[model samples]
Structures are given as structure tokens and as C-alpha cells.
Target: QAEWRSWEVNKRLEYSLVKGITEFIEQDTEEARQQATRPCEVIEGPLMDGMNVVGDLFGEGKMFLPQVVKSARVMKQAVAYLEPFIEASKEQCKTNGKMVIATVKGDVHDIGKNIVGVVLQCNNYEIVDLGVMVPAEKILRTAKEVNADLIGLSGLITPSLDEMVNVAKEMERQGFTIPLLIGGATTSKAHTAVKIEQNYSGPTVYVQNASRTVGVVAALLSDTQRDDFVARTRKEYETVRIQHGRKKPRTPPVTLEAARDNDFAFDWQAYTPPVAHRLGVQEVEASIETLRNYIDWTPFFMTWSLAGKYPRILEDEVVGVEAQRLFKDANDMLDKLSAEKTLNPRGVVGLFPANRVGDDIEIYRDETRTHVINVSHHLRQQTEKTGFANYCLADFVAPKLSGKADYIGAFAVTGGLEEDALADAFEAQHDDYNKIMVKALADRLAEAFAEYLHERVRKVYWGYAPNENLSNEELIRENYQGIRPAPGYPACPEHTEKATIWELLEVEKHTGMKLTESFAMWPGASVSGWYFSHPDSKYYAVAQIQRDQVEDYARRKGMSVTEVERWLAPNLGYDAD
Candidate 1:
């Protein structure tokens, strides 16, 4: 018997193929001839058997995402090599099903969706990726054109939630009953059931992450399994909806006037605002070598589903070995990145004259405070906090009535200006691992750059915390004095606020980081945020807000209340009409 035929050896097939499969097939042996003559059998037998092991191990949490991706890459390569042989033998090449995947309209977040496509493609499903910012019309049209058995929708922003529902409604209107799989940073099984599923009669399933997508897709496609799987899913969602409906009505937010009266108190006599060395926007071509020192490995590990703190995770018995391998691979890539200088790390930061006018902070073009360049409207914590002040970002700046001049900081940074191009090159070479790796690394670099720049702002640029010194680990823990809160994050839930930072810093011109219509940063690996240097400044979630505050915020922002409601949907305390 050939070595490849042995079940024990095939269990480690991915590792073997990584070393190369040509040697096994090129041999002048009976098994090699058989493999050539019956390529379909080879695929259905050994290749599938190997992939099944990968799937089981992944499902059981014994194998990590990167390992699963590695296995899938091996399977895809082996099948590609056997395609000609299968064709020559006059055997029909069959696939499990066809799936149309897309990043829903108004959102350009694509990494999660791309990973899903790759994983499903390796599972013998034909994938038609419609790319990012895909509209409902195009998605439905393509589904019909391809006669798709499934549709996968992905997004990462709150607005994308609305877009997903739009797609679901369109799918139902078009009378398509194909299964719909929803996954993204902002999607939840509860939200899928409560918001999207009710609109469509088809099976609407929520996949928590990329690793879980294949299993969900498989269950939905299997004739015998589909009914049972969907039935259980519907039951669970129904339960979720019932519980969601049971949620107690939120206590009404304090009136805007009353909340303002409880604002954070700052004593101007006791503390002096840190003076920035320069007052206007300035660009910096940050050193990639220095930025690398600020890389937080915790989130990177989490990306591959390797949980636990960074250095500690390396010693975890459950995930230690895989963690070590992933860390090594990351360091190897970093070494190459440093030596080759493949990425251009750049950023822009500005300290502007500003003062609060009600719920908005008006940024001045100069110290004279005569020309208002932009206004950032913020929402206050409406839900009552016991013995704590109702906080608002605008409170960090001095009120206009006080006649005290204040400064606000805005910044945007990109770790690798050539990130998209580099990923495309890897894709052109059919290097899935490297392609994913580069994109992931680029994100790390962008975040690292943000950290590095924030450090500079404190010690050098803004001249605050001049004597501050902290380790990267301490930095990751956010042990600093100030906060850098990005739009669409917990502290600031409205993504449209990103436009204020973009306009203030000319992010596109300075850092090549452009915002899409939905305000998702292009290059996909960039970071931007507002800086607050107040001694008491801290991060807090703007939980749910009452209608009164939303109306006031809309008026301050010069936008319609309905429009503001759409942007603040997740934070709305009351149901929208």
C-alpha cells in the first residue's frame, strides 16, 4: 500500500502537502498510476478525508483558524493539480453548492467576507464574491444569474445592519427562498432573528465567525439536515425575540439641561492646559521600525481565535503550541517587512482652537477663534448614573460661556500605504496564506502606528506627559492619562463622526486613508480618532439615549432627526417610527 493511502499518515496530510505533493504523485508506482487514472476517487477519498479531519478538529477547538486555513490551502492546491487529470479521465467535477457572498451596501469592510469565501470554496462550494459595498440589486441579480443555493452577507458597521435588512427585504420581495448567512463585527444571532429573519421566509442563519461559517453553510445545504437545522435555528431565534421583547423599557434620559448641569467639574485654577508645540495640522512619516515596537499581539491572536493575554497565551496549555507557531510566523513576516521596507507608515496630527457650544465642539482654524472650521456634535450619557456626572465629549472642552480657550486634537494614521497593493500581489500569486497574513499584519501596523503617534503627541508634539514612560504592555492596557476614542467605537458609536476627523486632518491627502460613503476607512488597515488630554478624560459607552437628546443632537449637527436616528440606531433608547 502507498504511504498516502494509510489513514494514519493521511491524518497529517496537510503538513505532508505543505512539504510538496509532487513527489507522491510523480513516483513510477502502481498507486501513483491509480491516482492519475482515478483523480476523482483520490479527491473524494484521501483529500476529503484530510479536510474532514481539519473540520472536526476546528469544530472541536483543537485546531485554530490559521491551521484550518492552511489545511484548506493545501486541499485547494491538490485539487487544482488534479483538475487536468480529472478532466482527461472524463469524470464530472461536482461541487456541493454555489454561494454568492458580498459585503453589504454602504460598507467596505471585506476581510471577514473574503475569509468566508475562501473557507467555503475549500469545502467544495463554488463561490462568487461580489466584493465590498455591494447593493441589494446587484446581490439579488447575481444570485439569480448564478442560480445560487446560498447568499452570504457581511458588514462591520452599524449602518451595514440596516443595509443587511434591506438586502433581506429585497430577497423576499424578489421571491427568492434561498438560505441567507449573516456574519460580521456588528451582526448578532439575536439581531439577525429580530431584524432580518422576519423580513424573509427563507432560512436566515447567523454565523458568529468565519470558522463557524462552513458548518452553518453545510447544514443549510444538506437536504436531510437543512430542515432540522433551520427548524432549530428558527426556534432559537424565536426564543431570542421573545426575550428581546421582554427587555424592560429604558428609564428616560435626564433632560439635556439637567444633564449639562451635572457635567464633569474641572478647576482651571488648579490645572493649566498643556500647550502644543504647534497649533495646526502637520504630517509625519513615522518610522515603521519604531511603530513595530508598539504592536499589540493580543488582538492579533484573537483574530485567529487564540484567546488569552499575549505573553501569557504563549504558555497556555490549550492553545500554547499553536500560539507559538503563529507568533513565530508573525515575527518572521515582521523581519521581512522591516528589511524590505514594503510599507510606508505615515500619520497627521493637529491641535486646534476649540470651545463647546451646547452639545457641539466648534474647532477654530486659528487661535483667534473667529473662523469655525468644523463642529463635532456629541451625545451625553442619558441613562442616569448614581453619584456620577452624565458625561459628554464636549465637556472635555471649555464651555463658550466660560470664555476660556481650549484645544482639541485630531489624528489619522496608516501603517502601510501599499497594503492593498501588497495583498493584491499575494492574491495574484494564489498565495492565500500570505495574502491574509499581509492584511492582518497591516492592521496590526496601523494600530501600532496609532499607539506610537499617541506617545509622541504626549511627550513631544503636544508637550503633555513630557516625563511619561511606559512599556508596550502597559500601553496596551491603556495605562496612560488621556484617551483616543475612534468613531464607531464604544465611546463614540456614530460612524459619520469620522468625516469630521477626515476633514480636519485631510486624511486622504496626508495619509492616503480615504473614507468610503459609509465612512469606513479605505486601505482597511488605518486608524483615526479624537484625542482628549484632560486629566479626568476617560472612555465610556454612550449607551441608549432618549428621543429628546436625539432631537437636540440632530438640530446641533444640522441634520434631520430621522437621519440622525438612522446613524444612532444602536444607541436609540426608543423604537423609531
Candidate 2:
């Protein structure tokens, strides 16, 4: 929080994420240029600030968990670059606050917990990370043992609400007096969830707001915890302000009493590129930067220099040539949309599962699968394909994109002075066009993608990915991986909107599982990924009989031990599952 004195100091903490330093050096100009010249410790402050932004947003709810977590992981790379002395410091040591964080009993999700650790570390807290599935007794014991100021609990399950109350009860029973904080997917402020604990937080909502635990613990750690938290928040608020340079908050969210007559000035300008548009590539880059800053599209920045780093990524064209081709495609998509006027929409959503598409590729290479979808892949792919680098691709063809084209030339400004600055100089100026066009194109692309996916399953097995032709052996291995963790475990979000008992039913149905012979064996569907209870699961086995039994079942389906070995992906996303 106030652990680092300046914005630069805190952004350095973002650098401290496990593998984030490399990406940091790539993304941050100052960090990149200074990497060889500066000692590693110099950047910790900035990394910490980056983590604080993530934490504060999650804590406060201005940001969601997925993005915050991804950002922190990126920050971890920068932090990881710092060796022991480099990662921590004497100044960071004697500063900020001290708190405890842990996943409560019955929960093993650690990404959110780890992210909070990063935030607190940057905010200048000494954290006691009790880690996953920590029991109430263990939490109280750790609190008593460490005599910590904060007791953080993590859970992504409704059942884990019991874990929290148990921890709280044990804390009271044992006379432990630290402020307890809770967080995870299962935790939300729907009024029902809030009453279980005095503090519910794992960075997403609570960290952003005036956290009871952070406030109380900070206060407990020092009389200055209040001042410290506020200072950090204010500094962050100011940093965002300065980053914008001149634009201030708009009056759109404010209120003014008015009689029947209220008039506002209207100065309409035909949507045009900035004054520097004629100044060549440098001018284009400048306009891109300005729009990126104002519209907040800086995060979407893409580069054409990826060819050398990944020459094998493409098969046909050189990187620069491909980049130009991509740009042309993006423009062409825009031009087509402008002519036909289909990019704008009235909220109808189209779905595309790209693996089914075959020919319209080269638009996206057949093998180019970004681990996370959305703007990272689709938007950039389409943009470069068409050729516009600025943020106005969607807007240029607009009123059409949203199906609300009042005026093809009408723009989104005219409210006020700050609005004018942000509008003219950056995002607000040309963003609507970009959003409208990008969305229209992405949806069409998504439909194309879905068709492509549907096609792939008809022929060659592309390894064992989704929509791939799964060999019978591989299919059997996935089905009987182990006793699958029940719902309300981590990552049920990807599984569904809310975890219910029927989730087990759905899983069983998906696997075509049916209890057989008064034992744990179940029937596997053609696409099998199920759970067996024993030696094949997570511990030293007492049940070789079941293991051999399950293996025999796998064999009947034509799965051999060798095929089972190749079933898992290169890495697990959230769980052993």
C-alpha cells in the first residue's frame, strides 16, 4: 500500500511476479532500457505498485478476479527475477504492515491467495502465507504462533463457509484476536455471504474497498494503518490522474437539478484522425499512443516484430509481410462491414468454435491457439489482418456495429472540457468505431472458428485437444484420471455459473458414469474423463486391487498403460484435474 513511496516503486513490484520480469522488461520502456544497466533491486517499487493496483482493484471490486490474477502472475515474473536480496529489502522489511493469508480448510485454490500476497507485499505487509486447505486449528495455531495481525482465509466453495466459521469459532475459543479476512469465488456480497465473517476478502472486492481486515489489521500493526491505506489509495488515484495527463473525471455520473429547460452546448466534428495523421509512421505511432492512453487500449498494444522471436509461427510469409497482410485484413473486414453495415448489433450474440474452420484461416494460423481468448487473440488477429493500428476500426463503420447507427458520421463527444481533451487526444475520440467494428468482425470470426472446430473432428486427430479426434485409448485415460474433485472446488466457474450438487450428476453424465457391480467402477462414455477412488488417485495406494481393476477396465476399452501416461496436458490450469 504505502510500502512503496512512488508509482515507479510500486510498478516494480508488478515485476516481482513469478515469471513477470521478462514480460515487464518487454512491456515497460524504462524497465527494459535499464535492465542491463541497473541492479535488479531498483525496480521492486514499480512491481509492487502494479501488484497493489491489482489487489486494490480486487479488494475494491473495480476489477475482476481473472484479469487481476493474470496481471499479478505477470508481475510475479519481474519479482522472480530479483534474487533473495533483490526480491525483498530492508526498507520493505521495516515498512508498511504485517498480515496473515491462507486458504481455509477444504479449499486448495491458491492463485487468489498468492495474488493477495503479492499485493500485501507491495503494500508493505509482512505476510504469513498459511497456504491451501489450512484447517481452522492450523490457522488459529499459526495466528497464535506468529501472533499475526491478519488472518486471511480462502475458499471457492459454499461448504467452505463452514471452514470459515470453524476458523472464527476456534479463534474465539482459543482467544486468538487477529482480524480475519476471507475471499474466493464462493465469496460475494449478496448480503447472505457477508454475514458469515467480519471480513470477506481474497483481493477482488475487499481489497479495493476500505477492507475491515486490512483497516483493522493495519491499525493493529500500527496506529498509522489508516493513514497508510489512505495514502496508498490516494497515491494510486493520483497516479491514474497524472497518467491521463490532463483529462479529469466526467460529469456524466454527476447530477444537476434542472427545470423544464436545460441546454448543453453541442459542437459536432466529423470523426477525423488527429492533426499528426499526415506526419508518417511516427505520427501514426504517436496517435496510437495517445488513443491507447485515453481509451485505455494501451493494454491491447500489439507488435509486428514477433517473427524473429517466433519465425516458426508462420508458414508462408515473412513477419513484416504477414504483419502488413494482417493489417490489410483488418481494414478489409472494416471496409466490408462499412459497406454491408453488419458489424453494429442490437445485442444478439453469435458463437464460433474456431477449430471447425478450415480455409478462412491464414486469417489466423491453424495452430495459433492463445491460452486465453478474447482481445488478446481475436482482436489483434483481425486488426493486423485488416491493417488499422489505431483504436477506431469499429467506430469508423459505426452506428452499424451496435445496430444503433443514428449517424454514420456522428461522434461521441460534446459533454465538457475534460471529455473534449480525452475525446480529441485519445480513446473517447475514436474508440466507439473500434469497439463496433472489432466486435462485428470477431463475432463473424467466431462463427467461422466454430465451423472450423466442427470440421476438425471429422478427420485427423489434432493431438487430444478439444474438438480433436480422441483415440479410444486416450479417451479412456481421460475418463478414469482419478477420483475427480467435486464441484465447489476451485475452477467450478469454468464448469458453470454456480456450483450445485447436480454438478456431480453432470460430471457423471458427461463421463457416462454409472455405478457398477456394487463397486466404484462406472461406465465411460466415448469421451471419458472420470475419477477412480484409489491408488490411482493422490496418495500412496492401499488399493492396488482397484488400480489394477480400473486399468483392466481401461484395457477392455483398448487403453494401455502407455496411452494413459500421455493423457494430461503440458500443464494443469487450476487443479490436479
RMSD per candidate (Å) reads: 2.9, 25.5
List, residue by residue over 1-577, the lDDT tens digit for candidate 2.
Answer: 4432244633444533322333334335345425534444344345555566666765665444323434544544443444354435443224465567787665543434654564455455777877566767777776777667677777654555556656666666676644556566566443123334333222112232223444545554576564565455445544544554342451121011110012111121443211110110000011111211122111111221122322233342434444344445445754654455432211111111122111011111112332212110000011111222211111122121132111100001111112112222322222322322243233333223222222222221121123444443343234422222221222111111111111222323332222221111111100111111121222111111112322332353355633322221111111111
Most TM-score-accurate candidate: 1
The model with the greatest lDDT is 1
lDDT of residue 213 for candidate 2: 43
In model 2, where is the ten-residue run with the lowest total lDDT? Answer: 276-285
TM-score of 1: 0.93
lDDT of 1 by residue, 399-509 (tens): 766777778888888877788788889776556777788888888988998998888888877778888899998888888778898999868888899999999988888
lDDT of 2: 0.34
> CA lDDT of 319 in candidate 1?
94
**Alpha carbon lDDT of each predicted model:** 0.80, 0.34
Candidate 2, superposed: residue stretches over 4 Å from native: 1-92, 188-577
Clashes of each: 0, 94
